[PDB]
Design a protein around this ligand. Structure first.
Ligand SMILES: [Ca+2]
Lengths: 8, 279
């Protein structure tokens, strides 16, 4: 929904 | 069977102690079971899936995994080299776009799809769904995850990567599904991992090597990587007839390595996924 996409 | 020089995560879930490199498992290896990976898709053509992977549903213009995240998680479920259940059938459902994003209505649709679709598939040993996604709390997202679980699918979901209490995140906060935290190779809770009373079990989630798009591999970190470990273990245990979809999460907690993890906040379970294999 809105958690991970690339961010480390 | 034994896989020597295995990824650390695989060795860990077949051992009572950290630091080993061999993955011990029963050669049945999840054959006859099915796992739906609900994510960015799966690159089905990757040689590591041996033709056991297929895309069944997409909510975008393509069914292609243009991100890598979905292929990575599917790989941990059941790729030849990086997978827990090395003979399971993998089904891809693309609810996330190539940026790793999706809206709640699509994710819910994807879950309802799986509940119905499993009735068209030959999965004599059972059906697992792996959800390496989440966002802020939503009662309707929680409800869809509960429905899928109710329908007779073992649902495993990421706790989330916010170093916070998973009660404020969905589908992680749905009590009825299996909510998965992450650990690292030294048996510490992963620094990013969510925690809290809603967590059911921990899985290897830091520095996990698995399949990637373009027929490649890479190592990444997340509760997204821990989840397919548990989902793959469920498929494995269901094939062996040790548990059912309704009770797999509970069975995994009961037979887990207990008390071995460090940096578990009070009120969070200290339980690590374990296959209990004995040659
Ligand atoms: Ca639960």
């Amino acid at each position: 929904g809105d958690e991970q996409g690339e961010n480390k | 069977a034994a896989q020597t020089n295995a990824p650390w995560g695989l060795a860990r879930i077949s051992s009572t102690s950290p630091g080993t490199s061999t993955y011990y498992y029963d050669e049945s290896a999840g054959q006859g079971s099915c796992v739906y990976v609900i994510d960015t898709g799966i690159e089905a053509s990757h040689p590591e899936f041996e033709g056991r992977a297929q895309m069944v549903k997409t909510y975008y213009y393509s069914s292609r995994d243009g991100n890598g995240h979905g292929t990575h998680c599917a790989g941990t479920v059941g790729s030849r080299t990086y997978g827990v259940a090395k003979k399971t059938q993998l089904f891809g459902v693309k609810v996330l776009d190539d940026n790793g994003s999706g809206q709640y209505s699509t994710i819910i649709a994807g879950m309802d799809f799986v509940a119905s679709d499993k009735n068209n598939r030959n999965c004599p040993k059972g059906v697992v769904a792996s959800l390496s996604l989440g966002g802020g709390y939503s009662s309707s997202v929680n409800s869809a995850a509960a429905r899928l679980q109710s329908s007779g699918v073992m649902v495993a979901v990421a706790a989330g990567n916010n170093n916070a209490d998973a009660r404020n995140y969905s589908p992680a906060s749905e009590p009825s599904v299996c909510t998965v935290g992450a650990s690292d190779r030294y048996d510490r809770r992963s620094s990013f991992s969510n925690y809290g009373s809603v967590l059911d079990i921990f899985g290897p989630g830091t520095d996990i090597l698995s399949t990637w798009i373009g027929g490649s591999t890479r190592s990444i970190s997340g509760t997204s990587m821990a989840t397919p470990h548990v989902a793959g273990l469920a498929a494995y245990l269901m094939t062996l007839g040790k548990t059912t979809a309704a009770s797999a999460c509970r069975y995994i907690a009961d037979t887990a390595n207990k008390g071995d993890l460090s940096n578990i906040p009070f009120g969070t379970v200290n339980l690590l996924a374990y296959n209990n294999y004995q040659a």
